Amino acid sequence: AVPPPPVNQFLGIYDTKFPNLTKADCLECHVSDTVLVQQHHALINTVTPPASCINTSGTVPPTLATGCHVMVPDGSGGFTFQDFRNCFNCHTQTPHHTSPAAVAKDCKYCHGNFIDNPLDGHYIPTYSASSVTPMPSGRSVTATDGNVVIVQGCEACHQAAPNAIDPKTNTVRPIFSNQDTHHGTGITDCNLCHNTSSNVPIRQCEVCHGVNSLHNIQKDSPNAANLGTVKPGLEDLGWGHIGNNWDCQGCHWSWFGN
Amino acid sequence: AVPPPPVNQFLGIYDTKFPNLTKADCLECHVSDTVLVQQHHALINTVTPPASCINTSGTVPPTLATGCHVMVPDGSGGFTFQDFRNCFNCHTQTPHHTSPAAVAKDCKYCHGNFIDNPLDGHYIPTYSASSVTPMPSGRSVTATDGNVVIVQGCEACHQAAPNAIDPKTNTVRPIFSNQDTHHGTGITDCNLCHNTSSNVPIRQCEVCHGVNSLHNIQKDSPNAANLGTVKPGLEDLGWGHIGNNWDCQGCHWSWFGN
Amino acid sequence: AVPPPPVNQFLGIYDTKFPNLTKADCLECHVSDTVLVQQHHALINTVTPPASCINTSGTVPPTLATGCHVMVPDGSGGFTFQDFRNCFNCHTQTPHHTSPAAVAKDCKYCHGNFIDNPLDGHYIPTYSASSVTPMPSGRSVTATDGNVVIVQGCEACHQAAPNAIDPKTNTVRPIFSNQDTHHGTGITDCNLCHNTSSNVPIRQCEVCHGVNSLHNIQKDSPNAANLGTVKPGLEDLGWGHIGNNWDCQGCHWSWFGN
Ligand code: HEC
Ligand code: HEC
Ligand code: HEC
Ligand code: HEC
Ligand code: HEC
Ligand code: HEC
Ligand code: HEC
Ligand code: HEC
Ligand code: HEC
Ligand code: HEC
Numbered sequence A, B, C: 001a002v003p004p005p006p007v008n009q010f011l012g013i014y015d016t017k018f019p020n021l022t023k024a025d026c027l028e029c030h031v032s033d034t035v036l037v038q039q040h041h042a043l044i045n046t047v048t049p050p051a052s053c054i055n056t057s058g059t060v061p062p063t064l065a066t067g068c069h070v071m072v073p074d075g076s077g078g079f080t081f082q083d084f085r086n087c088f089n090c091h092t093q094t095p096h097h098t099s100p101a102a103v104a105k106d107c108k109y110c111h112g113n114f115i116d117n118p119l120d121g122h123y124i125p126t127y128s129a130s131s132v133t134p135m136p137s138g139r140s141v142t143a144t145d146g147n148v149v150i151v152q153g154c155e156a157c158h159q160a161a162p163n164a165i166d167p168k169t170n171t172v173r174p175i176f177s178n179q180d181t182h183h184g185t186g187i188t189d190c191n192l193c194h195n196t197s198s199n200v201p202i203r204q205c206e207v208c209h210g211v212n213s214l215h216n217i218q219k220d221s222p223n224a225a226n227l228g229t230v231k232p233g234l235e236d237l238g239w240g241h242i243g244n245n246w247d248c249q250g251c252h253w254s255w256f257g258n
């Protein structure tokens, strides 16, 4: 839980925050309200008795069986409408991960090629080796500058910086560690992440974090005489997984002695 | 032009008839003849040469410049007075809608809060949406029982029943459709009702039929466990605009398939 | 360069091929990959800045100063790993004979007792005799069946059969003659094999091919009433150096007249 000497890059797909900490700017993947209107009202024709245009039950999750629109009273009556421009008045949760996809475990669809589908049949390593092997959360060792630092694992650099971020959007989006961005999705299938095969700490994650998908996650170089087609060697320290030998060492070896 | 399964309620402000079909019972808003006497003769002192107490021109509209009282001859002379107890011998038209109010477009004054003043600056919807939107006169579609019925519009239930009414007064007062109760007021300002902005059929009416004023028009429930403070949900079918989802569907959606 | 009437036995220590013609079955003397993993990754801790886990220089000989693992791109990126299961992707040469042993001339270590260490101080014959003496490559004489055959020398039966072999492994392993299996080891120290002492053709080889080590090289008998503890007499024709008088004659005498 300590970023590279370059601050933990976030040119990846999703900022690691819980869904609730996303802004009302879901507009990039849900293009605009002008299409969202029909994207919602198309659902009224789904049921033969149409979906109630008004939400009289008041349940914060508006099941289409109930309604969406809520009419809140005002001074001297004045029934008004709470809101439908912002998205966090009715969804207010993880809307995805309950969809049809992420129920047949088709997580790769809509999560990018960063991940392999947990049922894709990709290559998982069969050998029971442990000499140079990465572990979830890694382990800690004393660095050359005294500070106890975690090495040989995903938590060696995937870290929770909650305070100072400056992503492209240039707001504050608090980064979160693992075991809350994966549990914050609200899935309850422990067979997926925490099965009990092989008694190797990383072989559970190897499903949908496979070898051929983990050794491709690399962003562009600032100055490495390539400026394109990132070579797996000869790159900056951080900026991905297969960039510089420092990365391979941080996830595979100790990189701080032992 | 077909009422709800409950006959088109008329607990609203005005029965939709033309002014002429009103009875001589203007007494509720013009309290009594005992005050109407001075309400009229007060106007004689307005002009410095007083208003002629007799109407010698015989013009059915008695301009105060002319007189009001008419002396009709009888058998063998016998000059008598036609009448001044009934109101339809001299007014016989729409007296309002030519007043100072309804000339500065202050229609809300004396028409209730049902309407917004056409110059009130109330909220008109700016988005050019059409998926679920109401239109004047609506459109027709085949109902589940064969009869072609109009839906998605004001004319979906605002209807001309000319024959059998039974209002509170328990007389026969023939209800009239739109485009004659609005034109029967005799205003000639087409800029008001039929302007040519936005090319949306209901955005013209949105002036003085606004969103915040149309979603409040709701009468009391017969049996909906409230009997007071009508909730926008959980009410009888008819009885207003924001009573039951059936209403919202009748004016917004189709409510009969498509 | 003609084998005994029994095909040139190969129950000896090493098949005479160059290192490259060895199969990926180095497993017998390097027991298994399961130990080879730590046999390699133990070397990363040797240097204080660890050995780069990735080979970015692309030099086919992977100096530990460089790395070993190479990531070759694929269709649409797809960085994959070339191989590390097979041994001929990185060694591809004579790996031995550059080791610490075979640099202090400790060739006997890891070559068996077949050889004496070139600095062992073993007995070399001091007498300048030539009557019955063996020579490298021998000399040729006409056999009893017309075919010119080489006799009185090591090349009298140490021969290059490149085509049909059938060793224990039962594959094809092309046997090679001398001056390429000794030069194919890639040593450049001519002082060792081709010194200029005594002007006797075999006294150069006598270093690390001494008398007491050359007169012990004998395999088991097929049928010689011993079937164990091979007697230097009374054995089959071939099958070693001190087996039958035919052997002593082939290396010492002519055995075909003169
Ligand atoms: C949940 C599936 C809904 C039901 C049932 C209904 N509406 Fe809806 N509506 C919903 C959302 C998420 C939004 C926001 C759209 C946006 O761009 O933010 C809306 C919006 C409207 C609007 C505004 C029109 C616009 O262009 O912004 C209207 C007039 C509207 N909805 C009407 C409406 C009616 C009449 C319904 C009953 C037939 C109805 N909605 C149901 C979600 C949902
Ligand atoms: C409450 C009024 C809502 C708000 C605010 C937003 N959404 Fe919504 N959304 C709502 C409901 C009731 C439903 C469907 C419920 C069901 O049972 O399916 C949805 C659905 C969507 C969908 C998926 C549509 C589908 O094909 O099933 C999308 C992509 C979606 N909503 C996007 C979205 C966005 C971007 C919003 C902020 C502008 C938003 N929704 C707000 C109810 C409500
Ligand atoms: C430091 C060398 C790291 C270690 C150890 C691990 N990861 Fe990593 N990862 C690292 C960087 C610099 C990035 C790019 C960040 C970005 O957002 O651009 C990544 C990215 C990922 C991703 C992509 C998702 C994303 O938000 O970008 C995944 C799915 C990922 N990393 C997984 C992962 C796993 C499972 C690890 C332990 C086996 C792990 N990473 C270790 C840097 C480092
Ligand atoms: C039009 C503005 C009028 C003029 C000019 C005059 N009168 Fe009138 N008068 C008018 C009305 C509408 C009525 C009906 C009042 C009612 O309650 O129905 C009347 C009535 C009278 C009466 C009856 C008195 C009564 O208590 O009912 C009288 C005696 C009368 N008017 C006299 C009168 C005179 C003398 C006028 C000239 C000075 C005169 N009126 C002018 C309307 C109008
Ligand atoms: C003809 C004899 C009339 C009869 C019958 C009634 N009204 Fe009248 N009314 C009459 C005139 C000539 C005028 C004023 C003309 C003008 O130029 O202003 C009126 C006016 C009124 C008014 C408004 C008074 C004002 O402040 O301007 C009211 C509220 C009114 N009248 C009511 C009224 C009622 C209820 C009547 C039936 C009982 C009635 N009027 C009859 C002439 C005549
Ligand atoms: C309540 C529903 C009403 C009934 C029934 C009638 N009138 Fe009316 N009238 C009403 C109001 C609120 C007003 C405006 C009051 C004001 O101060 O302006 C009026 C006004 C008139 C006028 C005045 C026109 C003018 O120039 O000011 C007239 C001439 C008039 N009313 C006539 C009239 C008649 C003949 C009616 C019976 C058919 C009648 N009114 C009924 C409210 C109501
Ligand atoms: C059926 C669902 C309706 C549709 C479609 C529209 N309206 Fe309506 N309206 C409806 C009822 C049952 C009532 C109460 C009737 C009463 O008189 O009590 C109303 C009332 C109004 C009113 C109040 C005036 C009145 O005389 O009561 C107004 C101004 C009104 N309605 C306007 C209106 C418009 C502009 C519509 C189309 C956009 C429309 N209504 C549709 C039932 C229904
Ligand atoms: C040359 C001395 C190497 C360096 C530097 C690194 N590795 Fe290696 N590795 C090497 C060989 C010859 C092999 C083959 C072992 C075998 O049995 O064939 C490997 C293998 C691996 C593996 C596979 C694990 C397994 O059990 O087969 C891994 C995961 C691996 N190496 C990782 C690794 C890392 C992370 C390194 C940098 C710290 C690294 N290797 C360096 C030779 C060499
Ligand atoms: C390239 C990825 C390699 C492959 C394939 C194999 N080996 Fe290797 N080996 C490699 C390097 C870079 C080194 C060390 C370099 C140095 O400077 O020392 C080695 C070393 C060995 C050793 C000796 C280890 C030592 O103590 O120094 C042995 C015994 C060895 N390698 C065996 C071996 C076998 C059997 C292989 C096929 C399975 C094999 N190596 C493949 C690089 C590579
Ligand atoms: C038995 C006949 C062997 C076979 C087959 C192979 N190797 Fe070997 N190797 C052998 C010995 C006895 C030793 C020395 C052991 C020691 O402790 O030094 C080696 C050593 C190596 C080395 C190390 C070189 C060094 O610098 O120390 C390497 C790199 C090596 N061997 C590679 C290697 C390869 C690639 C083989 C398959 C072609 C192979 N060896 C086979 C014994 C035997």
Ligand code: HEC
Binding pocket: C004, C008, C009, C010, C011, C012, C013, C014, C015, C016, C114, C134, C153, C154, C155, C156, C157, C158, C205, C209, C217, C219, C238, C239, C240, C241, C246, C247, C248, C250, C251
């Ligand atoms: C025919 C009589 C031979 C003559 C002449 C020489 N050698 Fe030989 N050698 C011979 C046999 C049948 C064998 C056994 C083969 C086997 O691989 O089992 C050998 C073996 C050796 C060896 C052992 C190495 C090996 O690969 O087995 C050595 C080191 C050796 N021979 C050396 C050698 C020398 C230096 C010779 C000339 C002085 C020579 N041999 C002659 C048969 C015959």
Ligand code: HEC
Binding pocket: A125, A133, A134, A202, A203, A206, A211, A214, A215, A232, A241, A242, A243, A244, A245, A247, A248, A249, A250, A251, A252, C053, C054, C069, C081
């Ligand atoms: C964390 C994101 C990693 C980084 C950085 C590197 N590797 Fe990796 N590697 C990682 C995992 C989770 C695994 C699977 C091992 C297991 O037991 O689950 C691997 C595996 C390898 C292998 C083995 C290949 C095989 O087929 O088994 C190799 C050869 C390997 N890794 C090489 C390697 C190199 C050279 C790296 C630096 C460029 C490197 N890895 C970084 C996780 C991560």
Ligand code: HEC
Binding pocket: A053, A054, A069, A081, B125, B133, B134, B202, B203, B206, B211, B214, B215, B232, B241, B242, B243, B244, B245, B247, B248, B249, B250, B251, B252
């Ligand atoms: C006819 C009297 C209507 C009934 C019954 C309902 N609505 Fe309505 N609505 C109506 C109009 C004329 C408009 C304006 C749309 C335009 O383009 O002019 C609307 C608008 C809405 C909106 C949009 C709110 C906004 O700020 O734009 C919503 C959310 C809405 N209406 C909801 C709604 C509900 C839930 C209803 C049933 C209780 C309902 N409307 C009934 C006309 C009428």
Ligand code: HEC
Binding pocket: C125, C133, C134, C202, C203, C206, C211, C214, C215, C232, C241, C242, C243, C244, C245, C247, C248, C249, C250, C251, C252
């Ligand atoms: C080739 C592998 C040989 C075979 C087969 C036999 N001998 Fe040998 N012998 C060989 C060499 C290279 C030498 C050294 C001679 C030199 O000048 O370098 C010898 C030497 C002898 C000796 C001399 C012993 C001494 O102390 O000098 C004897 C007595 C001898 N050899 C006997 C001998 C016998 C009896 C053999 C058949 C069983 C025989 N040799 C075979 C090489 C080879």
